[PDB]
Structures are given as structure tokens and as C-alpha cells.
Ligand SMILES: [Ca+2]
């Protein structure tokens with residue numbers, strides 16, 4: 001009775017953590033710079049933002065995979081959070 005798989009990385013492929021879980025965790029939480037990240041998930045829409053839940057860079061997207069490093073804002077991976085719908 002499980003139909004949800006959200007796997008994302010909070011860093012480079014060969015240098016990041018693999019977060020594989022359904023809707024329940026607080027997105028992401030780690031102190032570091034907003035470097036290259038690997039986001040590959042297919043389930044509705046998700047809101048990505050590197051800051052609080054009421055004062056940060058809002059950026060949502062549909063089911064798709066990507067891994068940029070100069071087109072997603074590289075300020076600082078602090079107080080980052082993302083919820084999947
Ligand atoms: Ca990152």
C-alpha cells in the first residue's frame with residue numbers, strides 16, 4: 001500500500017547524501033553551501049526553497065530530474081526545505 005518514492009540529493013552525485021523517503025520528513029536540513037544538487041523525483045509538484053517557510057527563494061517544479069550548478073542560485077544551503085505534493 002505504498003506508492004511514493006522521493007529520492008533527492010543535498011549535494012553533488014559523487015559527494016552528496018541520498019534521501020529516499022515518502023512525504024513525512026522535513027525536506028532537508030544541513031549546514032553547507034548551495035552547491036550542485038541531484039533532484040530526481042516523479043510525484044505531483046514540490047516546492048523548493050533554501051530558507052525559512054516564510055522568507056526565502058520559492059521555486060516549485062513538476063516530476064523531473066535535473067542537476068545544475070549555475071542556474072539554480074548558489075547562495076548558501078542553509079535553512080533549506082522542500083515539500084513534495
Ligand atoms: Ca545542495
Ligand SMILES: [Ca+2]
Nearest residue numbers: 050076077078
Ligand atoms: Ca539554502
